[PDB]
Design a protein around this ligand. Structure first.
Ligand SMILES: Nc1nc2c(ncn2[C@@H]2O[C@H](CO)[C@@H](O)[C@H]2OP(=O)(O)O)c(=O)[nH]1
Ligand SMILES: [Ca+2]
Length: 104
């Protein structure tokens, strides 16, 4: 069973922890990767009711199982905060334009 289902992409907790650790490390060091500069702030324009506090950051999580290192980020993201607490796993899949919906 999937811990998080983003459209048809299936993630375990392990996938999420791995992606989040990479994104948080870059965040801590002040470095980014890719043309969209990940990780970057996530403004929560959608207004998700995250259980942890802002500020929030987003980092791509890939269905290949690899950690994001540039190139296309796909549709899915992990959102973490300043304390490296996971806020949620979100996706552009099934959402209009560049909006997001929560992975289930
Ligand atoms: N939909 C949405 N996009 C956000 C938010 N915060 C940042 N973004 C970024 O704002 C622009 C509009 O979607 C894009 O740069 C998107 O980038 P990402 O694709 O990297 O998430 C947010 O809270 N909601
Ligand atoms: Ca996996």
């Amino acid at each position: 069973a999937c811990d998080y289902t983003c459209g048809s992409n299936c993630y375990s907790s392990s996938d999420v922890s791995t992606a989040q650790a990479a994104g948080y490390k870059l965040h801590e060091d002040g470095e980014t990767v890719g043309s969209n500069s990940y990780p970057h702030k996530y403004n929560n324009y959608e207004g998700f009711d995250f259980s942890v506090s802002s500020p929030y950051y987003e980092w791509p999580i890939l269905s290949s199982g690899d950690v994001y290192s540039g190139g296309s980020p796909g549709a899915d993201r992990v959102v973490f905060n300043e304390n490296n607490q996971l806020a949620g796993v979100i996706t552009h899949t099934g959402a209009s334009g560049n909006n997001f919906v929560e992975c289930t």
